Copies of this chain bind each other. A is one copy, B any other.
Amino acid sequence: LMGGFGLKHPPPQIMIKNTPVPANPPTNFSAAKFASFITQYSTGQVSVEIEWELQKENSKRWNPEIQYTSNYNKSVNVDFTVDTNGVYSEPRPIGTRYLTRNL
């Protein structure tokens, strides 16, 4: 109901954690669990590749159709772009429904 595709078997969850690295144990045995750990974090790179199937528009209508377009008028910032501070923003919620079809 928010949108998208309902999948019985959706893309699986990818789970990740940093393996615990203990700090130095005491020199005499203690059966208590370790609360003492070496502070660490991890970084890396993640690639995702999806293949999408398209359904082309077959329409016979004579007149032109509504398209999603940028505005030609001048502006301080270009839409869908970084600003002077390096912040990427999205001006509007673009939807997918423009082309038309008969019932």
Contacts and interface: CB of A to CB of B under 8 A. Distances in A.
A78 B65 CA distance: 11
Contacts of A80: 62-64
Contact of A79 (B63, B68, B72, B81): B63
Interface string A62-94: 111111111110000011110000000000000
B64 A67 contact: no
A103 to B, nearest CB: 18
Interface of A: 62-72, 78-81
Given A63-B81, A66-B70, A67-B69, 6 more contacts: A63-B70, A63-B79, A64-B68, A64-B69, A65-B69, A67-B67
